[PDB]
Nucleic acid binder design. Structure first.
Lengths: 77, 62, 46, 102, 93
RNA sequence: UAAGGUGAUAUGAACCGUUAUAACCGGCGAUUUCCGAAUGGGGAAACCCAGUGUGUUUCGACACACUAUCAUUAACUGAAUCCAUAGGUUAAUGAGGCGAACCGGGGGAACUGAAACAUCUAAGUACCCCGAGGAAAAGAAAUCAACCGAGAUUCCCCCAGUAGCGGCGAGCGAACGGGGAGCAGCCCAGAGCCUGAAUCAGUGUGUGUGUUAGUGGAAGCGUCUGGAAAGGCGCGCGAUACAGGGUGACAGCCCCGUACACAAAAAUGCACAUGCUGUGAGCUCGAUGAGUAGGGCGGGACACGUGGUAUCCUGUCUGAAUAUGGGGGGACCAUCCUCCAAGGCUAAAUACUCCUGACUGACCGAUAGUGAACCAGUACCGUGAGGGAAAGGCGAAAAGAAC
RNA sequence: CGAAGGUGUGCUGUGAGGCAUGCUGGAGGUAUCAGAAGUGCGAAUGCUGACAUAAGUAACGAUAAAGCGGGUGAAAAGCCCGCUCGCCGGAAGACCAAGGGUUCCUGUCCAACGUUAAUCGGGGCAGGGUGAGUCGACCCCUAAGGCGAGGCCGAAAGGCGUAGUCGAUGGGAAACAGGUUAAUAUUCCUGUACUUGGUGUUACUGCGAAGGGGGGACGGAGAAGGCUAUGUUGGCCGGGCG
């Protein structure tokens, strides 16, 4: 499913509102990308399905902390 | 009858069990033949078999 | 004339049988409905 | 804890047999009791080929309610009410009037 | 089959039909009511242990029960298994 | 507990018992075929077909046990690929399914109203889906108030159909404050002195109380009518008991009960007292939650439909201070007041009743009341989902009509 | 010593009504003044049950067809037995699969069911009847398709799919004649056969798969030729001389 493994962002339902204020249901999808992160603690490439915001979170925190959170949450990566 | 049967061992209770099974078979043959008359002996032997099996399961170790 | 019901026990058991109902979630709901209503016969089986 | 046992002498309180003294024969579980020569009914017994073939009008006893009979005293000579008590270590029945063990 | 406890349970009753009588008179066969799950080897061992007679072969068939009426109620009698045990020469019961 | 019983239709046969293993009742046990989450593999449910390990054997074959998937921990094992990793086997623990309502969350209509209709309503309703508990959720102020103060959440009554929102139409609709039910506060982001001085939680013991069987439990006769008395008449008695139900008509004193006084070998709940393991009080120092608050864009929830619109959530793009700081006080600014987000936990008052027991009804009384007073979710209808009836009353007693 | 309810009669008020009493019924009813309503039916092509009319009317379901004798029986057009007659005969005959489930055979009964009667019946009741190494299923193999550990995908539900596992309508071993019951038979009996595995003994020997190669293994149409099932005729045998 379209879920960011770092942040948990899912598709979220909302409205397309016309100029006549016609409300038709729609989905906002996240900006998911499958990325191979070079983990140094294991000398490996770990593939994760991550949003761009999650990638910024990885850049800030460090991949080690993010993976620690993921494995504390479960999330077989 | 259970008070008397508790004296017996695992062997000599299996022998009793098998003897009641033989008697049950013989009563079944007479009954089915239509020449039993004493129809209540079938209830008696069946319950005796149940008693012997209960005492076997008690003395098994549980 | 050729009428609608043309019986076949294999087709009956694959269509409305117990295992056909247990295969899907909706069939399990059908069985739950019938078991709550109190049906003597829960499926076409037997 | 039943006030009338199998072979008590009883006296009929109500019904066509009122005042008649008899000896009870059976105590049915439906609260009815058979007493010797009390509630006589003439049954029209049909004959049958195999067993008890002689038919006829047979006068036998029907069951009356246990509440319709009272234990007969025979010391006072009257109908009486029954109560319970413990003597030595058993539940005995005692005549309400003249407080004596049956 | 080997267990005498099983042997004492497989056989149930003898059949008392005209076909059974003719089979006994001609083919040296005894007809028995037996259990639903009794196998041919079980019937053979049971007859040849309990009745103490040598057995040539056993044929079996399952009899379907009848849908009988009692008042407004529909009952269905229980199915039963019928065994044709052909003895070799000797018969006692 | 017991002098009677072996459930009913439902008679009969054969029996069992009668001072205590007949029966019946309650506690604790054993047995518990097959299908069914079904779990050794398969399958058109209740069937078909196996493997491994022990133990028997007349050498025919038998009996018992284990053998599913996934998740977590460990141990061995281990590629491309050197170390490694994925992976493989094994072992322990756990889960799977069902269930009426209440509960939280993820999705989410239309009919309809607006006398048409699109913003709006209906309505975050119906319905689908995920998840937990006996309750759930929320909960200890980056909250309100107003220069006076209050002090966590939850629920009821007002405030008030008010202020507001609104093709300012239809309609929607607060809060501040006040009165009540209940009332409880804590912990981590970390060190020292004091270390297990609070404190719950799992798991033993003693005493009182409760549930699962049960004991005793008062007192009425005569006469008339009548098929039959419990009715009438007369005269008596009990009542901490005149609730109710049976008995041949309407019974306080015939029966079963009721008031009331008692009872447990065994299991178990509730309180105290009272254990084992393990969780760790108090003072002092500190620290005190960043891709976060905030912002652009697009939506949504707030009574509030973007309007002059504060506050709250976030799909996308960005992005601080960090106690000399930051959030809020309904555009926005200044002063003042107030609180301290970006970590968690927490009983009561609250909600519902598949089921269990007691009691009640100006509730129905067989076309009513549940669809079903009765062998009803049945007969019958349909491929199926599904739909779905009719049908009570002899009599006090079968004495149910010998001949 | 007779309640409610039913059915008559008499009286009574302006009316909805009220009162009394005969018969039936066989056990409840209830003043007065207040209180509450599932409180009043002639219609809604109203709902449910009963009962009429049409009316003893139409119809009695292929126009293949019936007649007579005897028997049983309370009763015979219909059942049984017999003789004649007529119909089908690439079917209206025999046998399977599917579907059904006891309708099968015997004894008994005729209320209802049978478009009439019914002694009869696929009707009611009772008892009996379905016998396999070789037939079929199961089983071993797979087709279309289904399901599907990991896996990919998807708000949840869930979708797809790999290894694999199911899935016949197809491939895979083997039995034929005769006799026999009221009802089964390639199953029972008689006779004569065939198949596939286990284990022993014996003689010889290189055996081994989740692998390799062959076979299984395949279309439409057409023509013959050789045969057989089968039929006809002749011979032979048995009976006949109408």
């Amino acid at each position: 499913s379209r879920v960011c493994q770092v942040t948990g962002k899912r598709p979220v339902t909302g409205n397309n509102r016309s100029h006549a204020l016609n409300a038709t249901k729609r989905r906002f999808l996240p900006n998911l990308h499958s990325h191979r992160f070079w983990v140094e603690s294991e000398k490996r490439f770990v593939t994760l399905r991550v949003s761009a915001k999650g990638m910024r979170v990885i850049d800030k925190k460090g991949i080690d902390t993010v993976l620690a959170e993921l494995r504390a949450r479960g999330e077989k990566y | 009858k259970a008070k008397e049967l508790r004296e017996k061992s695992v062997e000599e209770l299996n022998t009793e069990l098998l003897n009641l099974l033989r008697e049950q078979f013989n009563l079944r043959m007479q009954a089915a033949s239509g020449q039993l008359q004493q129809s209540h002996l079938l209830k008696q032997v069946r319950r005796d078999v149940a008693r012997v099996k209960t005492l076997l399961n008690e003395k098994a170790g549980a | 004339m050729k009428r609608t019901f043309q019986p076949s026990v294999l087709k009956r058991n694959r269509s409305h049988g117990f295992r056909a109902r247990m295969a899907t979630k909706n069939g399990r709901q059908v069985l739950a409905r019938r078991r709550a209503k109190g049906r003597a016969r829960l499926t076409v089986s037997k | 804890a039943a006030k009338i046992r199998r072979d008590d002498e009883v006296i009929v309180l109500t019904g066509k047999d009122k005042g008649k003294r008899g000896k009870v024969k059976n105590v049915l579980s439906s609260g009815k009791v058979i007493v010797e020569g009390i509630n006589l009914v003439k049954k029209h017994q049909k004959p049958v080929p195999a067993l008890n073939q002689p038919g006829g009008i047979v006068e036998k006893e029907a069951a009356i309610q246990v509440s319709n009979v009272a234990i007969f005293n025979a010391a006072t000579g009257k109908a009486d009410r029954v109560g319970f008590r413990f003597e030595d270590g058993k539940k005995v029945r005692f005549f309400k009037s003249n407080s004596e063990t049956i | 089959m080997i267990r005498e406890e099983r042997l004492l349970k497989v056989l149930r009753a003898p059949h008392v039909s005209e076909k059974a009588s003719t089979a006994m008179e001609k083919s040296n066969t005894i007809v028995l009511k037996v259990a639903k799950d009794a196998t041919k080897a079980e019937i053979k061992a049971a007859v040849q242990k309990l009745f103490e007679v040598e057995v040539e072969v056993v044929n079996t068939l399952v009899v379907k029960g009848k849908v009988k009426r009692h008042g407004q109620r529909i009952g269905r009698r229980s199915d039963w298994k019928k065994a044709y045990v052909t003895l070799k020469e000797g018969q006692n019961l």
